[PDB]
Design a protein around this ligand. Sequence first.
Ligand code: SF4
Ligand code: SF4
Ligand code: FES
Ligand code: FES
Ligand SMILES: [Fe+3]
Ligand SMILES: [Fe+3]
Lengths: 634, 634
Amino acid sequence: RQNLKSTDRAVQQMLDKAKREGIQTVWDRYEAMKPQCGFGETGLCCRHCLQGPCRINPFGDEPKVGICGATAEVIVARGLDRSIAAGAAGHSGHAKHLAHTLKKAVQGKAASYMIKDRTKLHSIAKRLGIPTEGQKDEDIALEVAKAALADFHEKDTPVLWVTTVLPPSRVKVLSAHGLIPAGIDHEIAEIMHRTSMGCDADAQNLLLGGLRCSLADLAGCYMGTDLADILFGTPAPVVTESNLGVLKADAVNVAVHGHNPVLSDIIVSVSKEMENEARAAGATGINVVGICCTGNEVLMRHGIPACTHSVSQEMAMITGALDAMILDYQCIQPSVATIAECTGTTVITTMEMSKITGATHVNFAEEAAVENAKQILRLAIDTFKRRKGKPVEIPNIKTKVVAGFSTEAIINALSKLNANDPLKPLIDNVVNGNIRGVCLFAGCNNVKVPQDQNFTTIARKLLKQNVLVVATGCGAGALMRHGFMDPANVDELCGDGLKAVLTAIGEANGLGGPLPPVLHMGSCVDNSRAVALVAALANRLGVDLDRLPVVASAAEAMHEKAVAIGTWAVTIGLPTHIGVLPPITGSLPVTQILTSSVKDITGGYFIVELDPETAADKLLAAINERRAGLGLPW
Amino acid sequence: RQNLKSTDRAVQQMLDKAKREGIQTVWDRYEAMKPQCGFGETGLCCRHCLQGPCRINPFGDEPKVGICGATAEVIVARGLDRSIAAGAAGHSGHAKHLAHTLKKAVQGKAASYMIKDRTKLHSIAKRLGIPTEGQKDEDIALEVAKAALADFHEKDTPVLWVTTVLPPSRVKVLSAHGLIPAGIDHEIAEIMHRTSMGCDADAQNLLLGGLRCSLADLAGCYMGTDLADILFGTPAPVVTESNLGVLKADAVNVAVHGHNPVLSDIIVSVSKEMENEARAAGATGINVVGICCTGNEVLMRHGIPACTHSVSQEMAMITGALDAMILDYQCIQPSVATIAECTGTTVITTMEMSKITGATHVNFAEEAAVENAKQILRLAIDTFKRRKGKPVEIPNIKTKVVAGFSTEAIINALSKLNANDPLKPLIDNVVNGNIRGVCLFAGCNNVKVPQDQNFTTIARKLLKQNVLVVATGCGAGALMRHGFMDPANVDELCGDGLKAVLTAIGEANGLGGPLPPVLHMGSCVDNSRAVALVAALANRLGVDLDRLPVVASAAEAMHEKAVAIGTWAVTIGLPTHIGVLPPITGSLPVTQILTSSVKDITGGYFIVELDPETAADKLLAAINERRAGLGLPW
Ligand code: SF4
Ligand code: SF4
Ligand code: FES
Ligand code: FES
Ligand SMILES: [Fe+3]
Ligand SMILES: [Fe+3]
């Protein structure tokens, strides 16, 4: 019963093929892991020193406390903090790499890169306080890249990619609680110090540190989006397709997979130059397709079709038609390197700090980006040739996807209804009930949850209740692969009020039809775009974020990055659902802080709920409580 | 049988008292934890994402691989890397705090702090390339503090507290392998990124990253020593005492405990100002005593007696005479906060990122250091008053300790035998066999090992074989508490050749007697002093460190900091014993890299050996192999 594993029919088809071919998948490796350790599941395990491992029984008799005296409270809080720091390290490492890419570009060191979005560059410079009048664009961009790098360490200002992106009233609440990061890598290191043995051992103190480090993660996300938009262009609405049926047996199929699109944006453009070289090898052309967030990035900017997402990533290879899988970093199952030998896929790593035994490595360098891309595409072409005459099994399953809803694009779309107060039509429709509130779906799939089931179950209920739904990362992937980004499905999925608004906006944008049921706001760092939108609404209304009818749902969360995002969503003031258990239930006091008393600090709070129908009800109640707090009917 | 728990008779006496009083200790919490998890012991557990916890059976059947595909190799290497990063975060967080203290001092912002060692300041400035001629000391010190802070992030130079402290030939070997850190907090964050799910998945690549992050840890250690010496003075030989008998029933007993002595150095001086206030409360005075490395710091600089060390720290409180325990951060068992209620000790935290539930917090600030110290000592005095009339049980057990052997002091002592080539007498005696080689004992005690048993067993065998033994941290604590820093024990402990050299040096220093059997080089960051000595010998000889007959032994290792130190000892070229199992044995390939093939990268290697007699033999063989490589008899 492949339906217990994934709700995606293309994935189910490939699961049957993998089974008959004897290829182990993530779902088989999960089954082999059961029953999983209950100490780890509940957070009641510590390996922070060589006196361990230590554990605490959730209930019963000894052990009741760690060897050094660490309580369940401390152990749970320390483990959570390290997960936040690791997520911050990934989003901010991505951003740091792009800051170096921009600096190289404008110093003349890598002419394949350039300022593509001059408007974004100037706006970011203005937001940071960097002078633009009289200045060359290359100098403004050097100052922006220098400011980005400076936010990684202590200096005479706090992290500007926090303080300049949230409203002053929110910054004031956070500063009063000591939560504004001093430097991104500074906070990561401070977490690792304070959570090491014999240091911080007070749950409230530890968790305040975690909230602060989650804002370091937010800064990394926002910095990453900003810099990628400068370098590669700010997304605007685009139409494409998703799911495995976007692979083409007669083409060279090249997946771009990971998070940082610094090379894969170049691969997109070079692949078109090599169409005749591909034709000489017997292919129709080079068919670049996306996996995970590198896929989101090229989908949002170029309409490159999305093949698949996190938990089901191996299934692209099982088709037999995936000639190359070009990897950067984050969320890549290392199984891909062994599956590649079974499927004939060439798996290629490109980042120095993310290699996989058995995968060919290309030493990507911005200065050589075009030549690296051609070397990689030539390996893919050679791989296509080797599968001449071999049948493939591409499920003939795909959806239509309208995407590219950056915050700038959303504002522009709304401006067609109110040119000089673009947010007002959205607010008007929240007030009159046509839009009940806003829900951001974010984060990953998780093998513990039948793939996409929580995202689609929750989304369906919210849409019928007139919630405006936006999505990023694998949440966007889940929704796109089930038709939620096809405007043809508005009548079926949306309540009458939401349908009326999506139709009014779409008709004013010349579409003869509505916006899609769900707005794709991009990759995981692009959760920062949702922050920009919500902060803009807060500023337009003169209220803080914790008064707005806006929630988030990491409905199938997996990565440390998703824990970090959920933690800053709480910290900026949002009710934040998580649909998998984080390792917290072994401490009632920590659980109570994260789900209840943090409301008194930041206004936000976690909603931990594994049943998706129940989670939908709790998210609706959170939205409605915010409506009532504003004096609105609900 | 308290002898199974600690070889320290004072500790055994307090273990009997704790047992009859019903006070749980670290040894009782260890017993309650048995049997410990074998997945964690071997390294074959991963909790890096919410699909976990994952584990791998060391032997047998499934599970054989993590859910995402991570092999045993990857899981073990990732866990080790995070431990190195956490150790780097602690030593370097200490150093960063002292850099801010120095900056405050010379900016006029905290007049309790000052440049005490102007010679050290000028030498550090010269080593870094900072101009001194014509410059005010306060300006030279601002530039030194700015350079210290700059080494935490990327810039146009690598980490100077690596590249300027090792010989050029060693820097060249490390650079050729990509091992020179770009920035301290940069590397910490990169480790956390690369070890997060779906990133680096090649054991060799992961472990190269770990070696590089271990050099970030070395930079933090060296920076910490440098800055503490500027601010507080470079140690010189001093005579004091150790063990619980240094507590005095008729005095206010105040322990300073942690690692960063920024406040506790001030407490030492203020305590003497308050002698009449203590007398008015019925005490003879204020008796400051050391625990762990804050204790090492004040012992090395001021001869403050050391009460106890890591694993036995609770036993100071069990005496009933410990009126206050003043905490900074690292290596503090959080049990102290609950034991304090049973024993009448006031436990006081002082650092913002290291609090303990149930302990009073004082918001220490450099600008208020004297007033904070008086507030703290007044709480201690009030606590002493509350124990008027209550019997105490201080074991009447102490040793004589000669300490204060900074590298500068060792060079000065040797200079009495050769004024203008001070290292030559040491080298001469290595060549003629009076000194077989050098062994650094470093790192902690660990509840799994009867306290001090490995340190003293190994040291005894090495000393009889004419090894010059130096020690830091809890290694120094172990050795001092068993008489190894009392020159009266040279005849008993030392081989004839070593005795002859220790006597010759001592007699030339006017002592009428030898140097002590073991030279105390200070706190854990002061392992950097041993690097300075070994690098100076390498430079004098014109060879790299991996040719020298010098080894290290973390004989009872515990903290992530000790894993980091052991890892940079290997990276700089030393055979490095560890006497507890780190979580590596679940991967033979990783074990083989760390104990064998790393020799081909850096020249150093781990020696994992839990039996101390066997470890002594293996350390001797390592020393002797180095002698033979130099053409020397052995
Ligand atoms: S830090 Fe404490 S709880 Fe954690 S492993 Fe070490 S002794 Fe156990
Ligand atoms: S990172 Fe891989 S091995 Fe680790 S918990 Fe997640 S699925 Fe398991
Ligand atoms: S005891 Fe299983 S996660 Fe540690
Ligand atoms: S299974 Fe015990 S340490 Fe994770
Ligand atoms: Fe993503
Ligand atoms: Fe120490």
